[PDB]
Amino acid sequence: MSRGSSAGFDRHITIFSPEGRLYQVEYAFKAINQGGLTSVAVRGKDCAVIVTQKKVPDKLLDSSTVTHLFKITENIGCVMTGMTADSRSQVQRARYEAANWKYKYGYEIPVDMLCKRIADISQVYTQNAEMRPLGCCMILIGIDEEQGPQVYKCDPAGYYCGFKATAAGVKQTESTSFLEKKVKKKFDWTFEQTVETAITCLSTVLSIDFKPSEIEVGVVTVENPKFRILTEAEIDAHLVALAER
């Protein structure tokens, strides 16, 4: 780094710990937790759904601008958890990479490749001294031509694995446990079923019943591969359906 490498093992990204752990990556994960929100993504056999809690702090704040659901391309959308600025930067980088892939290869980038590129950039961040890992987490969704719905979460360390039900944020562990319980019980996993699973998982881990304005839901289905943001009325309808049954 231009300023200079730090002294302590946990004070710099590059130098290792006696075990060999990199404490700066773990602190980036702690920053992701510091984001303050929780995001849940569920993969079905017909659609992929991402649900995250929307918290407009002040009335003066315009709720329209407050959103963590961003679209990378017309068919791929993402939900970001962690620092807002870092998440925006990663979203811009993913958009640029997807556009470049489309330009160079003649077909839309798969979700797995998008996260692979993002994770490679993250690894580059964690290896050099000048830069620092981004304190945010990326969860990408999209319908593949042959593999169907795909959900991938994409972390500061550089891990780009894919999941049947992804969770990220403050309540990542509890959401993961709930989603594992639900997955162990294999339902039909229809569109509305996946939406209900995500919403009820988030409500259970947050111990609160959401109104239409407290969450934002983005969906992408096989029939409609375009990334779609659920309108507040549709979220309210889903919540009413959950309440009834």
Binding site: D58, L60, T65, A85
Partner: protein
């Protein structure tokens, strides 16, 4: 508290906080309050510009910048960083007009400048900007749009906000103000009233109120409030403060 983690912007604290960005936010808080209220017709700015000496000519260290024909800029925090970011925004808007042939949307310009600030906060060679600013514009299609950018690099639209020393008091005043139903004239009068209310004459000896607005009455073009209307707003603020 990040005792050994607050020296570089590329170092994470054990809890996951970059303390240099927070120190930049505090530096912004050190500055006098600058408020801006968005209404149906447009956006009106207002800054409590403290005069350090009577020697300075009126208008010195202006906190209101015209980054584009239709975009205003009310800045707080360090003045030098404010000027630098204003120049960056001017280059961005110039470039958008040159390339796509039409005025840059307010949201896009806010995103560009916010990402510039975030990029500056990313590395250790450079330090995070010590200023926060408000980008506001009005258009016939886009409508009245007000945005605020934090030294961290966020970009959130507002119906009204404040940055500086008395941020919370101004925010409460704007909260109890019903901006969505008032015109630009009433909005500028209330902005002057709020600025006078939040000003602390004890700690701060004196200040000069700078007012600018962009809206339909200005034909979607940012400009300083005319001297007559500004004087009327100052008189109304004086009357409100007296009672």
């Amino acid at each position: 508290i990040g005792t050994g983690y607050d020296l570089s912007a590329s170092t994470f604290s054990p809890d996951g906080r970059v303390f240099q960005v927070e120190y930049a936010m505090k530096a912004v808080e050190n500055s006098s309050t600058a408020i801006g209220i968005r209404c149906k017709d447009g956006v009106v700015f207002g800054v409590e510009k403290l005069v350090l000496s009577k020697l300075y000519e009126e208008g010195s260290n202006k906190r209101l910048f015209n980054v584009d024909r239709h975009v205003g800029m009310a800045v707080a925090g360090l003045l030098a960083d404010a000027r630098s970011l204003a120049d960056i925004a001017r280059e961005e808007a110039s470039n958008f007009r040159s390339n796509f042939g039409y005025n840059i949307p307010l949201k896009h310009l806010a995103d560009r400048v916010a990402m510039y600030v975030h990029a500056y906060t990313l590395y250790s060679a450079v330090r995070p900007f010590g200023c926060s600013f408000m980008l506001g514009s009005y258009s016939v299609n886009d409508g009245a749009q007000l945005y605020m950018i934090d030294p961290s690099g966020v970009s959130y639209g507002y119906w009204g906000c404040a940055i500086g020393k008395a941020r919370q008091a101004a925010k409460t005043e704007i909260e109890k103000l019903q901006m969505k139903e008032m015109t630009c004239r009433d909005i500028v009068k209330e902005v002057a009233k709020i600025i006078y209310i939040v000003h602390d004459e004890v700690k701060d000896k004196a200040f000069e109120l700078e007012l600018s607005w962009v809206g339909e009455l200005t034909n979607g073009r940012h400009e300083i409030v005319p001297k007559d209307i500004r004087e009327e707003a100052e008189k109304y603020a004086k009357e409100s403060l007296k009672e």
